[PDB]
């Protein structure tokens, strides 16, 4: 209780907020669907888990979309200053993106600082993710220099972490816009409804995005068009192809569409046709090639039978439940679980062709063994496989070294033949 | 890349935004049903098609409703000024309504100007529509005088054209309020649902309207009552009888 002078980083925050009173500002607000983000993010994180990678977040995706939008609408990167007593527009060389990092200090008081990712307009998603994680990592270890806090041209803030719906923030001198990301959650009139009922209707989740801009150099129409572009990108085919390409995921991304009525051919019939398609033709998209190579003059077969659009199903059916007739030893299942099992059995490192066989007992024997999966081997077994691989490669290298010119027809490239025959 | 002085109409826009920093402002937001607008607008446009007339828009209807609301709550038309070094309230003679016209120029850069429809408080819907279309028509042909840009008392803006949900705009010196009209569309939690399912439930479409006002001369209660009146008019029997009678 009482009065106490402001000292330190807090004094600097206070002075800058006072300076910011000389910027005329306006704000725009827009709400956007968020279902396709949830779906496609899950697909990327499944790939990283098998390759013992990390995990991407929603801020990463929205960050990258924001960069693409600023490239499409360059006026959002400009600023204002008075130089030699004349009004002036400032057009920077690069897009440097400022992240609001909330970091506790040694004392035990939280402070907010803005660090920059630099030269962002010449990056793909892989490069962007690396730069992001670099800044975050060095912040925790306390290894940020003074250069990292200089040259910001546009900023991003995330009040939706706590659960705020949207905000109207302050703009600091030297920039033209600041973007805010709100909560990704059901509206509050639906927060007591059942999952079953929401699934029937087709209700999705939101994200609300704001734009606060300096009105001396940016007009309202530009700000609106900026937010319209961001909305389009997060539901766009070409945008998710870039991200999937860069993270090396072998599947087609989930697409955006309206929910369709259960009329004509029933939806249970359509799920059974999808099961039959994977059992018959799933080998056409399996991960069986060690190289990332497609031979230029060979025809590529049609494999449109393996996407859920051709069977009149949609993202809105993934959490609904269906009759599957004993598939997986169950009478009932969700479309999410069906797709998961089919992909694990027919699209990983083993591809199988067996549906052309005429006898029913043969087909059933193979089908049962391929859908159970490969059993986990013991440690002794694993070491035995390593001994055989070593023998193969070592023998080849010995002959190479001692007899150079002599013809031997090597097995290098195909050393797994020795453990297969064994 | 680099620095360049601001010249022309852009310099004027910059100077006015700097002057506007000396107005204390607050904002109110309200959402309104929009189903009856869609229905009744369709009925009016069917009549015009058979009589080889034109077509009315949503801005025309909301514009007329806004005028009726200002008549019901006259305080929304007042402004503030310091004259002979004393604070003063200014009560105008007429309601002059400013339209935000986005017009491209010869160079190829968009600029925003505000033109006025004058003496609006003595007009019916037929007269209002004519005056509106007059200003728009002359703007495209490049035949607006200097008198058309003077004497605005209250303004209207439409960020919902692009699809923005709502905005918080700036107020310029000499006025007391500015009204903003947002997107007329389903909320984003329903943008992937089927038509069949929405029809069963009974889900309608929205419109969000804002009010930004000078707090030295207008209080919050007045601003709220203004928006409540606009909400009532757009769903009112007597309001749609006037429009149908006139067309």
CB contact under 8 A, B167 and A220: yes
Alpha-carbon distance A82 to nearest alpha carbon in chain B (angstroms): 9
Q: Give the three-state DSSP class for B63.
A: helix
- For A70, A111, A209, A278, B187, the CA distances from A160, given in Å and listed in that order, are 22, 18, 10, 40, 19
Cβ of B199 under 8 Å from any chain A Cβ?
no
Both tokens of B247, joined, read 């067309």
Residues 6+ apart with CB under 8 A from A366: A352, A354, A357
Distance of residue B5 Cα from the nearest chain A Cα, in angstroms = 4
Q: Do B164 and A30 touch (CB under 8 A)?
A: yes
Three-state secondary structure of A253-298: CCCCCCCCCCCCCCHHHHHHHHHHHHHHHHHHHCCCCCCCCCCCCC
Give the dihedral sign, CA A211/A214/A217/A220: positive
- The verdict on a CB contact (< 8 Å) between B192 and A186 is no
Q: Are strands B25-33 and B166-168 parallel, antiparallel or unpaired?
A: unpaired
Contacts B165 to A, Cβ<8 Å: 29-31
How far apart (Å, rounded) are the C-alpha atoms in residues A392 and A401? 15
B14 vs A316: CB contact, 8 Å cut-off? Answer: no
CA distance A186 to A318: 18
CB contact under 8 A, B166 and A29: yes
Exposure class string for A267-279: b at 16+ Cβ within 10 A, else e: beebbbebbebbb
- How far apart, in whole angstroms, are the C-alpha atoms of residue B84 and residue B207? 44
Smallest CA–CA separation between A22 and chain B, in Å?
Answer: 8
Count of CB atoms situated within 10 Å of the CB of A215: 21
Q: In what order do the strands lie in the sheet with A97-104?
A: A110-117, A97-104, A154-157, A177-181, A206-214, A25-33, B166-168
CB A360 within 8 A of CB A330: no
Distance, in Å, from the CA atom of A45 to the CA atom of A244, rounded to the nearest integer, reads: 11
- Catalytic member of A60, A215, A283, A356: A215
Nearest to B194 among A93, A224, A258 (CB): A258
Q: Which is nearest to B205 in space by CA: B230, B182, B228, B227?
A: B182
In sequence order, the β-bridge partners of residue B176 are: none
Using an 8 Å Cβ cutoff, are B77 and B95 in contact? yes
DSSP-derived letter for residue B2 is E
Contact map slice: A 132-171 vs B, CB within 8 A: 168
Give the other-Cβ count within 10 Å of A376's Cβ. 7
* Interchain contact, B159 vs A31, CB within 8 Å: no
Q: Hey, are the CB atoms on B1 and A91 less than 8 Å from each other?
A: yes
Q: Chain B contacts of A258, Cβ < 8 Å? A: 192-194
Q: Is A279 in contact with A355 (CB distance < 8 Å)? A: yes
Taking contacts as CB-CB distances below 8 angstroms, the residues of chain B near A169 are none
Comparing alpha-carbon positions, the chain B residue that sits nearest to A212 is: B168
Going by the DSSP 8-state scheme, the letter that residue A132 receives in this structure is: H
**Is B166 one of the catalytic residues?**
no
Task: Give helix A360-372 / helix A335-346 axis angle, nearest 10°.
Answer: 100
> Is residue A195 classed exposed, middle or buried when 0-12, 13-18 and 19+ CB atoms within 10 A define those classes?
exposed
Q: How far apart are CA B104 and CA A12, in angstroms?
A: 43
A-chain residues near B201 (CB < 8 A): 201
Q: Which two structure tokens, joined as six digits, stand for A205? A: 């989740």
Q: What is the token pair recorded at A208?
A: 């609300």
Smallest Cβ–Cβ distance between A24 and the set B163, B166, B170 belongs to B170
| Region of residue A272 (phi > 0: left; psi between -120 and 50: alpha; otherwise: beta) | alpha
Determine whether the interchain pair B167/A29 forms a contact, defined as Cβ–Cβ distance below 8 Å: yes
> In whole angstroms, how far apart are CA A37 and each of A51, A287, B29, B53?
22, 25, 30, 47
Contact assignment for A33 to B192 by CB distance below 8 Å: yes
**Residue whose token pair is 């090396």:** A248
Chain B: give the shortest CA distance to residue A394, in Å: 59
From residue B26, how far is each of A220, A264, A369 by CA, in Å? 19, 55, 70
What 3-state class would DSSP assign to B181?
strand
**Do B1 and A87 lie within an 8 Å CB cutoff?**
no
Q: Which of B60, B73, B94, B215 is catalytic?
A: B215
A386/A392 Cα distance (integer angstroms): 10
Tally A–B CB contacts below 8 A: 122
Nearest CA in chain A to B20: A24
Q: Tokens representing B58?
A: 């949503």
Contact B193 A203 (CB under 8 A): yes
Task: Please classify residue A311 by burial: count the beta carbons closer than 10 Å to its beta carbon, then call 0-12 exposed, 13-18 middle and 19+ buried.
Answer: middle
Pairing of strands A97-104, A154-157: parallel
**Which ranges constitute the DSSP H helices of A255-405?**
267-281, 335-346, 360-372, 379-402
Q: Which residues in chain A have Cβ-Cβ distances shorter than 8 Å to B166?
A: 29
Parallel, antiparallel, or unpaired for β A25-33 and B166-168? Answer: antiparallel
CB contact at 8 A, B173 and B77: no
Which residues, 6 or more positions from A314, have their beta carbon under 8 angstroms from its beta carbon?
A257, A258, A259, A260, A308
Nearest to A187 among B20, B157, B189 (CB): B189
Query: CB neighbours of A9 closer than 8 A, spacing ≥ 6?
Result: A111
CA distance A381 to A226: 58
CA distance A153 to chain B (A): 13
Cα-Cα-Cα-Cα dihedral sign, residues A152, A155, A159, A161: negative
Residue A20 at interface with chain B, using a CB cutoff of 8 Å: no
Which residue from A204, A228, A260 is facing B194, i.e. has the nearest CB? A260
To which H or E segment does residue A421 belong?
Answer: helix A417-421
Angle at A130 (CA atoms; ends A159, A93), nearest 5 degrees: 80
Task: Note whether A33 contacts B: Cβ–Cβ < 8 A.
Answer: yes
Quick check: A79 and A90 in contact, CB under 8 A?
yes
- The b/e string for B50-80 (b: 16+ C-beta within 10 A; e otherwise) is eeeeeebebebbbbbbbbebbeebebbbbbb
Contact in structure between B48 and B125 (CB atoms under 8 Å): no
Closest C-alpha among A300, A304, A232, A244 to residue A274? A304
Residue of B3, B13, B170 with shortest CB distance to A26: B170
**Cβ-based neighbours of B21, under 8 Å, separated by 6 or more:** A21, A22, A24
Residue B162 burial by Cβ neighbours in a 10 Å radius (0-12, 13-18, 19+): middle
3-state secondary structure of B226: helix
B192–A31 CB contact, under 8 Å: no
- Token readout for A335 is 């479309």
Two structure tokens written together for A25? 């500002």
B83 touches chain A (CB under 8 A): no
């Amino acid at each position: 209780p009482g009065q106490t002078p402001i000292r330190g980083i807090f004094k600097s925050i206070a002075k800058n907020m006072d300076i910011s009173l000389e910027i005329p500002t306006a704000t725009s607000v827009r709400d956007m669907p968020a279902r396709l983000m949830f779906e496609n993010r899950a697909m990327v994180n499944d790939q990283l888990k098998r390759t013992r990678g990390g995990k991407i977040s929603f801020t990463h995706i929205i960050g990258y979309a924001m960069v693409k939008a600023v490239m499409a609408h360059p006026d959002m990167n400009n600023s204002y200053d008075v130089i030699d007593g004349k009004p002036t527009l400032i057009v920077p060389e690069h897009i440097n993106l400022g992240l609001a990092i909330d970091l506790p200090q040694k004392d035990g008081s939280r402070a907010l600082v803005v660090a920059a990712i630099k030269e962002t307009e010449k990056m793909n998603f892989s490069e962007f993710l690396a730069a992001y994680e670099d800044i975050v990592a060095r912040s925790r270890k306390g290894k940020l220099t003074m250069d990292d806090y200089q040259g910001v041209t546009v900023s991003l803030t995330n009040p939706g972490g706590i659960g705020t719906r949207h905000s109207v923030p302050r703009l600091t001198k030297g920039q033209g816009t600041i973007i805010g990301v709100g909560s990704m959650d059901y509206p509050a009139e639906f927060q007591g409804a059942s999952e079953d009922r929401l699934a029937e209707l087709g209700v999705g989740k939101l994200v609300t995005i704001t734009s606060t801009y300096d009105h001396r150099v940016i007009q309202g129409a530009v700000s609106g068009e900026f937010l319209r572009t961001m909305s389009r990108l997060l539901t766009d085919d070409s945008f998710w192809d870039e991200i999937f390409d860069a993270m090396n995921v072998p599947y087609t991304p989930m697409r955006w569409a309206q929910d369709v009525p259960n009329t004509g051919v029933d939806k249970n019939t359509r799920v059974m046709q999808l099961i039959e398609a994977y059992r018959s033709r799933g080998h056409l998209i399996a991960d069986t090639n060690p190289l990332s190579w497609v031979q230029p003059g060979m025809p590529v077969p049609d494999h449109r039978d393996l996407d859920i659009e051709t069977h009149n199903l949609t993202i809105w059916d993934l959490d609904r439940t269906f009759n599957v007739g004993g598939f997986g030893g169950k009478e009932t299942m969700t479309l999410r679980e069906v797709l998961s099992r089919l992909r694990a059995a027919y699209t990983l490192k083993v591809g199988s062709e067996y549906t052309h066989i005429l006898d029913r007992d043969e087909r059933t024997w193979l089908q049962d063994r391929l859908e159970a999966g490969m059993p986990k081997p013991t440690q002794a077994e694993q070491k035995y496989i390593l001994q055989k691989l070593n023998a193969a490669e070592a023998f080849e290298n010995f002959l190479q070294t001692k007899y150079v010119g002599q013809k031997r027809f090597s097995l290098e490239g195909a050393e797994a033949l020795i453990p297969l025959m064994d």
